[PDB]
């Protein structure tokens, strides 16, 4: 599992920060302190964290990930990280 996708909305200096989908690594999610849930109406689960994206990026570096690309889409700011 070398690729990771995290994101935040509206403002970057505050969370929540989406850190995973239904098929994400349970350990990594746990290490990040992420919670799981399925928003009413949505057909999928998501892992989130209340930390600002910066914090999550630092934590992810410790686990061996590096930011490859960052982009905006809608009101969502997304980061694509790669491990090994």
């Amino acid at each position: 599992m070398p690729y990771l996708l995290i994101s935040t909305q509206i403002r970057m200096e505050v969370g929540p920060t989406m850190v995973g989908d239904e098929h994400s690594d349970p350990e990594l999610m746990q290490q990040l302190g992420a919670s799981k849930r399925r928003v009413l109406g949505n057909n999928f689960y998501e892992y989130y964290v209340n930390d600002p994206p910066r914090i999550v990026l630092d934590k992810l570096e410790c686990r061996g990930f590096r930011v490859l690309s960052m982009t905006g889409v809608g009101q969502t700011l997304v980061w694509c990280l790669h491990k090994e």
Binding site: V39, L40, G41, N42, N43, G74, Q75
Partner: protein
């Protein structure tokens, strides 16, 4: 357990009695020709306004759900609705606007109407009424998304000054929540 016709018959006298009591407590004469039948007419009226309790989405679910293999937005707007303020027991009136992105399954107008009828005919709070209708449609069609908008006037507020003042609530699910374009298109096609 949903309310039953028996419950109404067994409770009508209790309601009637309460209203007769209310008439006296107001300073009126329950004996006036004009007030004689009032306790029953009032009780019956209130039962009608809350007849939504004696029903469930299930009674509607199965019935009419044809498959025209449709997969594009369907909207039904300007659906009149009448409900009761649960805080003052005074009615709030308005319109309901619905939209959904079908996942093959479409909803008949008759069923849609029934759904709105079930939840609006109860002691309510506008936001709850909005969510219940949206969720009910979601469960009856397993659609890609659904949106519900309600605008209403609250008599409990109007009869204290307002008749022009309106409350607007909405509940967006699925693509209606996640895709700003869908939400915009929906609000454009209804705000006509």
């Amino acid at each position: 357990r949903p309310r039953s016709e028996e419950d109404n018959e067994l409770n009508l006298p209790n309601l009637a009695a309460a209203y007769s009591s209310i008439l006296r407590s107001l300073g009126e004469d329950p004996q006036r020709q004009g007030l004689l039948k009032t306790p029953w007419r009032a009780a019956t009226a209130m039962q009608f306004f809350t007849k939504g309790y004696q029903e469930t989405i299930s009674d509607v679910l199965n019935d009419a759900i044809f498959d025209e293999d449709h997969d594009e937005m369907v909207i039904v707007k300007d659906i009149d609705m009448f409900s009761m303020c649960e805080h003052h027991l005074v009615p709030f009136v308005g319109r309901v606007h619905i939209g959904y992105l079908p996942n093959k399954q479409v909803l008949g107008l008759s069923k849609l109407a029934r759904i709105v009828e079930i939840y609006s005919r109860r002691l309510q709070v506008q936001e709850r009424l909005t969510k219940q209708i949206a969720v009910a449609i979601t469960e009856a069609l397993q659609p890609a998304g659904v949106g519900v908008v309600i605008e209403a006037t609250h008599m409990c507020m109007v009869m204290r000054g307002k008749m022009n003042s309106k409350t607007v609530t909405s509940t967006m699910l699925g693509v209606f929540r996640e895709d700003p374009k869908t939400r915009e298109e929906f609000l454009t096609l209804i705000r006509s």
